[PDB]
Amino acid sequence: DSRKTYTLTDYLKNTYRLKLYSLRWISDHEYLYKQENNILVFNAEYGNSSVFLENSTFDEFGHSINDYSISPDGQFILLEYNYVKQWRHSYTASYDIYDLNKRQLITEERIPNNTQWVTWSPVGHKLAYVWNNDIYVKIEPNLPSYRITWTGKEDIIYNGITDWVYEEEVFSAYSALWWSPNGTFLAYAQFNDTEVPLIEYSFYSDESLQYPKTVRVPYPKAGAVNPTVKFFVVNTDSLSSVTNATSIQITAPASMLIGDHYLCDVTWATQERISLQWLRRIQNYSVMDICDYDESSGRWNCLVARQHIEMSTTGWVGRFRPSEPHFTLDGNSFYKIISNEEGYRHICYFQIDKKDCTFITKGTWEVIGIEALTSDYLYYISNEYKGMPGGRNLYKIQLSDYTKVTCLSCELNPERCQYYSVSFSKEAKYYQLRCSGPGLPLYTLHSSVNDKGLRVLEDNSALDKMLQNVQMPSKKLDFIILNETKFWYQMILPPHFDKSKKYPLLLDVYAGPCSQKADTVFRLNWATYLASTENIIVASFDGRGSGYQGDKIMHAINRRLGTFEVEDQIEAARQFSKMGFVDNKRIAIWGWSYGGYVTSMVLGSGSGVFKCGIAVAPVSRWEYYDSVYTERYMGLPTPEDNLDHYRNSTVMSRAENFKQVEYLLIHGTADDNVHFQQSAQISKALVDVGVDFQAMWYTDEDHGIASSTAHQHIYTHMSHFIKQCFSLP
Amino acid sequence: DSRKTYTLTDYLKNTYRLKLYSLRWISDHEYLYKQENNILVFNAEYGNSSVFLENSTFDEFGHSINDYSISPDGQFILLEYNYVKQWRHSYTASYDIYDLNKRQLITEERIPNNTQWVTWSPVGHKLAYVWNNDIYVKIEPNLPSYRITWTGKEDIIYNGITDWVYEEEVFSAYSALWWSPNGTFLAYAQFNDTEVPLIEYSFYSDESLQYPKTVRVPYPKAGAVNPTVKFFVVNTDSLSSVTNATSIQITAPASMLIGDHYLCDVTWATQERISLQWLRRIQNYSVMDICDYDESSGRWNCLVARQHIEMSTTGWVGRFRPSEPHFTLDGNSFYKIISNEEGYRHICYFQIDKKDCTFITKGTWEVIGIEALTSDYLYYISNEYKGMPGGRNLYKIQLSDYTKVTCLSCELNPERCQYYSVSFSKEAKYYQLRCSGPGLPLYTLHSSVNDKGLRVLEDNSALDKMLQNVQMPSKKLDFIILNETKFWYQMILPPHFDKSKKYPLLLDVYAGPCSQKADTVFRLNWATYLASTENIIVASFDGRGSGYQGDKIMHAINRRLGTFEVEDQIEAARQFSKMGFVDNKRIAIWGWSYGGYVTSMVLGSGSGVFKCGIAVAPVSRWEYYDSVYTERYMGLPTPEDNLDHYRNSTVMSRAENFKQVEYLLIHGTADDNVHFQQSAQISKALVDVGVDFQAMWYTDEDHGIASSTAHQHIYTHMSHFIKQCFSLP
Numbered sequence A, B: 001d002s003r004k005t006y007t008l009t010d011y012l013k014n015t016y017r018l019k020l021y022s023l024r025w026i027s028d029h030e031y032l033y034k035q036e037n038n039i040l041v042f043n044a045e046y047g048n049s050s051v052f053l054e055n056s057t058f059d060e061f062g063h064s065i066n067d068y069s070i071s072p073d074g075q076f077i078l079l080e081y082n083y084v085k086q087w088r089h090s091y092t093a094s095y096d097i098y099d100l101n102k103r104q105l106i107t108e109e110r111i112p113n114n115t116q117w118v119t120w121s122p123v124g125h126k127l128a129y130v131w132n133n134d135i136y137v138k139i140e141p142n143l144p145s146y147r148i149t150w151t152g153k154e155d156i157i158y159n160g161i162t163d164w165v166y167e168e169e170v171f172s173a174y175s176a177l178w179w180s181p182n183g184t185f186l187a188y189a190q191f192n193d194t195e196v197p198l199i200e201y202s203f204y205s206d207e208s209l210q211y212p213k214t215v216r217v218p219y220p221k222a223g224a225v226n227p228t229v230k231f232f233v234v235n236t237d238s239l240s241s242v243t244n245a246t247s248i249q250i251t252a253p254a255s256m257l258i259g260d261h262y263l264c265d266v267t268w269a270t271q272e273r274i275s276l277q278w279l280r281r282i283q284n285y286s287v288m289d290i291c292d293y294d295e296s297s298g299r300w301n302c303l304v305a306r307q308h309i310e311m312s313t314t315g316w317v318g319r320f321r322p323s324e325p326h327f328t329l330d331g332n333s334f335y336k337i338i339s340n341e342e343g344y345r346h347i348c349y350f351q352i353d354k355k356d357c358t359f360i361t362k363g364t365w366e367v368i369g370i371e372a373l374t375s376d377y378l379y380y381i382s383n384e385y386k387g388m389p390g391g392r393n394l395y396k397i398q399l400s401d402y403t404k405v406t407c408l409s410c411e412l413n414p415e416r417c418q419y420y421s422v423s424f425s426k427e428a429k430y431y432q433l434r435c436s437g438p439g440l441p442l443y444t445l446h447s448s449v450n451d452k453g454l455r456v457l458e459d460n461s462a463l464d465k466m467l468q469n470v471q472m473p474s475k476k477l478d479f480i481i482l483n484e485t486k487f488w489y490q491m492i493l494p495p496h497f498d499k500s501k502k503y504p505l506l507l508d509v510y511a512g513p514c515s516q517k518a519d520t521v522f523r524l525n526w527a528t529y530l531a532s533t534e535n536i537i538v539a540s541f542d543g544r545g546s547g548y549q550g551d552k553i554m555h556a557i558n559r560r561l562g563t564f565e566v567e568d569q570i571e572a573a574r575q576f577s578k579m580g581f582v583d584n585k586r587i588a589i590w591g592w593s594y595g596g597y598v599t600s601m602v603l604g605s606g607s608g609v610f611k612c613g614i615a616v617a618p619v620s621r622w623e624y625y626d627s628v629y630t631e632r633y634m635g636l637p638t639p640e641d642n643l644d645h646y647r648n649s650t651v652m653s654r655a656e657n658f659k660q661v662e663y664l665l666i667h668g669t670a671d672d673n674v675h676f677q678q679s680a681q682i683s684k685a686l687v688d689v690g691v692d693f694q695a696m697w698y699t700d701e702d703h704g705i706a707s708s709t710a711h712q713h714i715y716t717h718m719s720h721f722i723k724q725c726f727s728l729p
């Protein structure tokens, strides 16, 4: 075979790029698509397009624009620039608004610099933005903005934006604003972090900075004082420039107010009905309030009879939080994914006025998400097909007869496509399917009336032809049995794999709760290079604690992080080592983040299975990590709750057992998520017992270690380490 | 040869231990010594002893006693416990006083906990101590203290103790108080750090600490705002007669007050005469005031007729600071080591009111220090003997005839002993000689009346026996000639050194200004292991900028750090190749501190000479280092002064050239001296240009990386690295 292999440089320089087709639906019939930096509008039925915005119109703009956002009526475009990253989702930017009718920039009443968040209303062209932690509303892009809140205070009071923990662990967003469906009301949360302790770490910046600066971030570690939260709704149709806006508060239910709690979901039901879910700090009890606007009062009333309790006896509520309700047109009923009596996640149908919900799906598999809802059909994604928890397909269920379930993606191309996501148009007249494996990604457009496959948007033809000239690895997805339970694994196998030769094996671990590392997704990554060029098998295993297989598996690690999920990785590797094609003298393990924790726990286990391993930004002790995530799984680190297990599940306590392995420990110094602290305590424990190891800090890098140069450097360094570990003397 | 080598474990575990003879003179005739944890008092003349304090007297004390000190009158002992290290010299401790006459502890009016410094008066049993940054005086150990200052303020005002930079760079001590010779007056300095910027860094502490602490220290980096200083004298004899005794200020001379300046020396001359040396921020100009108590005004006056100017046209003043004066009994004249007209440091004799001094020693060699002064003789240490700048001997010069110079130590044991220090009794009636190489340390007692040897105190016989059975390395001390100038080097050579073989060479570097790494000292260290077990030649070289050889050499790097001292190390490696016993494919370089900087500069020079190197806690950019040290050699980092050279001598600017070498970078995270910042910027610059390298951080370790476990871990880590660098594959 004279073809080149998939090398480290190919991964690092992105030589082989997957093609995408990211569209944005603007109506029931049309979508926007960025082609050649021109924004085109497409008609879904025929495939014809027009140029909505020529790539040249902002040639004289002055700044490089980061992103575009067209108002829902197509009259305005928000130009985003001076982008400055904060955390995972948060950033600041400058904004300008361009009038699409006039074909001119608006120069009056501009959105301020250092704006923290901006959003169009869902209909028309109102704006709401947050600046210096306060909310502002613009009825028209050129008009003076109304100031909604006056309490905004850096690191202390947050209006319409989340603090650190709510951004990272609750909403997965900086935004804490929720327009009503037609833009009449703007709902928002206010966070108060007054008593929340600060994480502090050094930032070194450019060489020219003489004194490092100290970054200070309100961050509750497990057991610490949490932010408090309030919820408000303001009518944006009755604002005055003369009087200050009035925000109506909707207070949490009594069952929440008795102790610490969170706001975890906000979902508008109708123009005049809002739902909110609240979660106790002890995350096994949550309640939904359904609140109606009272025209006489001007107030929002949440009737007790419309209250819905969701709890768990085996673990926490929801995969990472209580799930999202999907309301019908009239908002009188709704659909919601919840754990059934057998512990599998399925769609339940609720009346707003009734306590008992009715499950409309069932079986030993799970609904992943509800994707669209019409009066006749609910569309959802599940891993039902072929009983493969790592595959994903689109289904529809007839609302008048639940026996009638149709798979819409299963048979389109079963050899190439077993993992789908979907994007529906405004009223679900059309949908885009995005197949992402096991073959190359495939984007297709369909119409809902008879599920016609209209056309192929992107089939990655170019890439296919290029990859033909490369010795690409294959992927095996299979299972092993442990106490009569299937647990799935995948192996990235070298080209020309020979079952009679012995290969070194790298165990690629994440293994966080609800994690899935064995799936049918096609990926070009570090593992691709390891298999193709270095002839290493890269395996991953989903053991106890993994998701999408029911709560019996998922909740196995409840109150018990660093136990079964760690043990199951060792057990999988033990079993892989007995296969004929695995060199048991050369088994390695690595992981990032949660997987760095598991890797570290595995290496300190004393198992003798692993010769070496690499931990990148690992958690080392659960009390160091954030409250919302940690306590979900661990409860509170007090003697009357779960302290003994917080204390038993540290990497540090296992330091001695590292004496018989090669360990590389890596961490960014500006990691705001898993603090450098965590690795600092590992290294010190190893030093204290006399264990040699390898280390690398990345100056000013965060949890992603994703700056272009650091990303190349880390993978280069880890490759040297693995190759050295696997070299035969 | 079948003897064991000197191994890493021998070094790390202190297998072969140097015996010391640490004595403390308590009078002209007696000294204290610890034998089997007892404290014996010795008669110097006859060698007989009694037990002064039984090793059992503080069994029921209830604390570990860190140290003790007896009042000069023998009446009390100060017991130090709860010792907590601060910087290089500073610490805090608890103190009890034990009455040696009544033979009981004092329980009344105790020195408080967290005391920063305490000292007995030179005579009697007065105490002065510093607590919460203020000075207190007890006339009697059991009576209430008199408060002296009320301005003390944590990190802001320091009374009687130094701030960070004065401690590290100016006084090499924490204390900033000075009792007059009979204890009447207490002089002290007051430091004001109000506007000095803070270095900030994380300290992680024990694993139990949930949030890391931020250590904040006033620390002026180069060109930043310095502390200001004031000087005061209080009459402690007046304390019990007056409510609040006045601290009389002695202001700096006009020539210092025009700009930033330092107090660099305080020395009492008589009971009523104090001398002070001040140094301009531009450290090539210093002024000594000599100040008399004016009995009729209660004031201190410094006559300009007694003011002495010390300046330098070629560099800074002094080796590291203007030298200390030694006053004759009457306080009307004094001796001082200063640079002569040829650039050599020699003893000059001054009358306090005549500006021209008389040199009493001369030659192409240097006086190291003045050790004692009697009415007839001055005793000093120089490197005159055999023109060996790396040797040290004690000399006696007759004050009534300067042609009469006797070397007291030169010929005592010429092959074993070429490096001496000395400890004189109170009125120099006896002296202990401490020989420290090139053979095993040898401690001997001598009487000044006749300069006859009284007895050997410690000869290290035990160790000599053990070392017979070990294949010890040898040391070659010699010179090479560059541009008509002698430049010294030493080599630690493996046992059975054969000039016909090619050996790997490690260049052990420091090379800061006035450094000396080529000397006659006997050391048991990492180099001993590398030569003995690993058959590596370990070399060091004293190039331009090195000390004890005159200002032509020392001042060569003036305003030009990171040039000649770097180039000369490279050139030294080339010359060691010429010698024909060096494997030119296996030349390594390493150093700590200034040596880490030079190592890094050498490795990024592009010379091709060195295969690999290790930098531990390096400086990387002069603007990151402290003002007093950096500015001494580099002046100010401003466009008008020396900014261009500051910017030109960073490690980071040579990042691209590290592609040619193997590099290991090591730094303690809690380094208060050379901030982790310095290594954080090296790593980032290397990541930025795509260079692979090895790294190790040491959690909560400081500049010394001296905790027991970290010390073993770092030398282990470095050993593996050097061996891998040198291995023939």
Ligand SMILES: O=C([C@@H]1C[C@H](N2CCC(c3cc(C(F)(F)F)nn3-c3ccccc3)CC2)CN1)N1CCSC1
Pocket: A168, A169, A172, A319, A320, A321, A512, A593, A594, A619, A629, A673, A674
């Ligand atoms: O960063 C973290 C945690 C992980 C946590 N995070 C976990 C995964 C989660 C997530 C990731 C994905 C994706 F991979 F599919 F995209 N989907 N989800 C998800 C979110 C809500 C409901 C269902 C699924 C998004 C939030 C956010 N903070 N660490 C935890 C232990 S080590 C570091």
Ligand SMILES: O=C([C@@H]1C[C@H](N2CCC(c3cc(C(F)(F)F)nn3-c3ccccc3)CC2)CN1)N1CCSC1
Pocket: B168, B169, B172, B319, B320, B321, B512, B593, B594, B619, B629, B673, B674
């Ligand atoms: O830590 C430092 C500096 C070094 C400086 N330090 C330099 C050495 C100096 C010193 C060391 C020694 C000894 F090694 F012999 F004991 N003697 N002296 C000394 C002091 C005053 C006068 C004469 C000699 C004592 C002060 C104190 N801070 N760095 C400078 C460049 S990298 C880090």
Ligand SMILES: *[C@@H]1O[C@H](CO)[C@@H](O[C@@H]2O[C@H](CO)[C@@H](O)[C@H](O)[C@H]2NC(C)=O)[C@H](O)[C@H]1NC(C)=O
Pocket: A182, A183, A184, A235, A237, A271, A272
């Ligand atoms: C959006 O929905 C809101 C809420 O129903 C509408 O506001 C109401 O409209 C009704 C019907 O005309 C009026 O009688 C009420 O007085 C309004 N209520 C409030 C609270 O304002 C609003 O008209 C809709 N907006 C758009 C643009 O369609």
Ligand SMILES: *[C@@H]1O[C@H](CO)[C@@H](O[C@@H]2O[C@H](CO)[C@@H](O)[C@H](O)[C@H]2NC(C)=O)[C@H](O)[C@H]1NC(C)=O
Pocket: A151, A157, A192, A193, A194, A195
């Ligand atoms: C944010 O929360 C803090 C409580 O952590 C509030 O401050 C308290 O307010 C009450 C009533 O005004 C005072 O009596 C207390 O002294 C405050 N407590 C503390 C610990 O500071 C604060 O008012 C809240 N801010 C907002 C805007 O809601």
Ligand SMILES: *[C@@H]1O[C@H](CO)[C@@H](O[C@@H]2O[C@H](CO)[C@@H](O)[C@H](O)[C@H]2NC(C)=O)[C@H](O)[C@H]1NC(C)=O
Pocket: A282, A284, A285, A311, A312, A313, A314, A635, A640, A641, A642
């Ligand atoms: C939510 O989790 C907590 C913690 O596991 C549960 O509280 C425990 O319940 C029983 C008592 O009925 C005992 O096992 C423990 O004493 C309780 N533990 C703690 C820490 O309080 C609680 O029952 C859970 N909620 C639900 C609905 O299951």
Ligand SMILES: *[C@@H]1O[C@H](CO)[C@@H](O[C@@H]2O[C@H](CO)[C@@H](O)[C@H](O)[C@H]2NC(C)=O)[C@H](O)[C@H]1NC(C)=O
Pocket: B150, B151, B244
């Ligand atoms: C001892 O005298 C000093 C010097 O006058 C007093 O310190 C002054 O106190 C006043 C009032 O508190 C301050 O405004 C001055 O700035 C202080 N000066 C200095 C130099 O510190 C001190 O308070 C006196 N002590 C007693 C017990 O009276």
Ligand SMILES: *[C@@H]1O[C@H](CO)[C@@H](O[C@@H]2O[C@H](CO)[C@@H](O)[C@H](O)[C@H]2NC(C)=O)[C@H](O)[C@H]1NC(C)=O
Pocket: B182, B183, B184, B235, B237, B271, B272
């Ligand atoms: C220590 O020296 C001081 C300062 O000279 C002595 O105090 C002086 O003593 C003489 C008496 O001989 C008096 O005339 C002065 O008034 C004193 N001066 C001051 C400033 O107090 C002191 O007596 C000496 N102490 C001892 C113990 O000898």
Ligand SMILES: *[C@@H]1O[C@H](CO)[C@@H](O)[C@H](O)[C@H]1NC(C)=O
Pocket: A041, A042, A043, A046, A048, A049, A050
């Ligand atoms: C597509 O074509 C139809 C005519 O057949 C037209 O009405 C429509 O506006 C076109 N859409 C776009 C986006 O160009």
Ligand SMILES: *[C@@H]1O[C@H](CO)[C@@H](O)[C@H](O)[C@H]1NC(C)=O
Pocket: A094, A110, A111, A112, A113
């Ligand atoms: C943003 O900053 C620039 C540069 O300082 C300034 O000229 C501009 O007016 C600012 N924009 C707004 C909306 O204030």
Ligand SMILES: *[C@@H]1O[C@H](CO)[C@@H](O)[C@H](O)[C@H]1NC(C)=O
Pocket: A150, A242, A243, A244
């Ligand atoms: C609105 O409220 C803020 C803060 O409470 C106040 O400063 C401002 O003057 C108010 N304006 C009016 C018009 O009431």
Ligand SMILES: *[C@@H]1O[C@H](CO)[C@@H](O)[C@H](O)[C@H]1NC(C)=O
Pocket: B041, B042, B043, B046, B048, B049, B050
């Ligand atoms: C040493 O011996 C002499 C007697 O010759 C005696 O006076 C002296 O006190 C003794 N000193 C000690 C410390 O034992």
Ligand SMILES: *[C@@H]1O[C@H](CO)[C@@H](O)[C@H](O)[C@H]1NC(C)=O
Pocket: B151, B157, B192, B193, B194, B195
């Ligand atoms: C310290 O200096 C500041 C000026 O920076 C001054 O305001 C303060 O009074 C000083 N404090 C003293 C000398 O006690």
Ligand SMILES: *[C@@H]1O[C@H](CO)[C@@H](O)[C@H](O)[C@H]1NC(C)=O
Pocket: B282, B284, B285, B311, B312, B313, B314, B635
């Ligand atoms: C001190 O240093 C500065 C800068 O090198 C210089 O301009 C000045 O003349 C120097 N003083 C002496 C006495 O050489």
